[PDB]
């Protein structure tokens, strides 16, 4: 649908918020998220901690003001018009139905159904420490996948951070692990439809055909470069020391 950009700049401060707020698992540091929400891709420019209170001792019990956003957007606007409210974040890592209520607050404040944002404040597992949701209906809410933009400005200072194949395999288990269990979970959790929804694509395997040969046929040439790959080695470094040592081992005049 409108699946969305992600601003690391957000992501960072977001945890600072979590940090700043000293939010803990008891809590989720919540706040605006900013961008412009029109397109079938939405962007996250920015986001703002909404000074907030959360109580799950009573689910619906929690405290927040909008009027931040009120004054906020003003400045935000005054900062940039393109702030236009896309939605909001919280810590998370997970939902709590009161979110729904909370979600709807922003509905007043957003063009579309606004955008939830989960964060993993511990960034624990994997790609994203994050989920973004839009409500729905039998309610619906949903995660459309999202990701980063450029923000090379980001990417550059980013560059100042960090500092081939086997990984690619490694996830191999992962989904499968849960997956079968996830059945057995829901199986023996409810011992839904979506599981069968999965079930079909399963045969999408043992699918392989003598089209396999193509592979073999293909792989051949792949190797043809072999004699060439190291041929230049074969020729290159070997006849290189014979011209430097004969020069040298014999150099040896006086």
């Amino acid at each position: 649908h409108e699946k969305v950009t992600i601003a690391p700049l957000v992501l960072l401060s977001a945890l600072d918020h979590y940090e700043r707020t000293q939010t803990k698992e008891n809590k989720r540091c919540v706040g605006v998220i900013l961008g412009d929400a029109n397109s079938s891709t939405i962007r996250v420019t920015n986001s703002f901690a909404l000074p907030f209170e959360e109580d799950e001792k009573n689910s619906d019990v929690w405290f927040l003001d909008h009027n931040y956003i009120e004054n906020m957007n003003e400045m935000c606007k005054k900062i940039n018009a393109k702030e236009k409210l896309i939605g909001w974040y919280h810590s998370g890592p997970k939902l709590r139905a009161s979110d729904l209520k909370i979600n709807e607050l922003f509905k007043k404040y957003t063009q579309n159904n606004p955008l939830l944002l989960i964060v993993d404040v511990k960034q624990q597992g994997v790609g994203l420490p994050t989920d973004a949701y839009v409500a729905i209906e039998e309610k619906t809410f949903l995660h459309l996948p999202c990701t980063i933009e450029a923000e090379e400005a980001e990417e550059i200072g980013v560059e100042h951070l960090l500092r081939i194949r086997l990984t690619n395999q490694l996830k191999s288990l992962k989904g499968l692990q849960s997956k079968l269990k996830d059945v057995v979970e829901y199986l023996d959790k409810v011992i839904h439809t979506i599981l069968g929804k999965l079930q079909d694509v399963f045969n999408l395997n043992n699918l392989q055909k003598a089209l396999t040969v193509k592979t073999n046929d293909e792989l051949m040439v792949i190797y043809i470069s072999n004699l060439v790959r190291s041929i230049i080695a074969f020729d290159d470094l070997i006849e290189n020391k014979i011209q430097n040592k004969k020069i040298q081992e014999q150099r040896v005049k006086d």
Partner: protein
């Protein structure tokens, strides 16, 4: 010259002629074998090129040579592979195989692997000698 044909007499004739020279080099022990091998070689060639030939037409080469020793002689040949064919005497049909494939198999890629395995020959050797000036130049 014989082994081109492998004509046992003409074959032997050489030996008959050169045995001492063979003996001189004691290559004599050899060839005593390749005799029928080339016979079987011919048997394989410009001959197995039908999905058969008959018993007797392939026996013809043995009707040139021998009979129903053919059975042995062909089994003698088939024994080793070195040819690929079958028969049924019950058919009387000496049934001479394709030997036809493509590189669908890993057979090329075996050779590629063979080539692959060699990828270290000169490659790893370059490092084998990288030393000498490079290291002695330090001296």
């Amino acid at each position: 010259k014989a082994v081109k044909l492998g004509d046992l007499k003409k074959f032997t004739s050489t030996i008959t002629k050169y045995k001492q020279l063979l003996l001189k080099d004691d290559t004599y022990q050899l060839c005593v074998r390749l005799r029928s091998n080339v016979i079987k070689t011919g048997i394989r060639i410009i001959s197995l090129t039908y999905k058969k030939i008959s018993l007797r037409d392939i026996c013809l080469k043995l009707n040139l040579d021998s009979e129903q020793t053919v059975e042995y002689m062909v089994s003698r040949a088939i024994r080793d592979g070195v040819i690929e064919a079958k028969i049924n005497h019950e058919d009387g049909f000496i049934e001479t195989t394709e030997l036809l494939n493509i590189y669908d198999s890993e057979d090329p890629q075996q050779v590629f692997d063979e080539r692959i395995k060699f990828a270290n020959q000169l490659h790893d050797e370059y490092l084998v000698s990288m030393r000498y000036p490079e290291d002695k130049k330090t001296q």
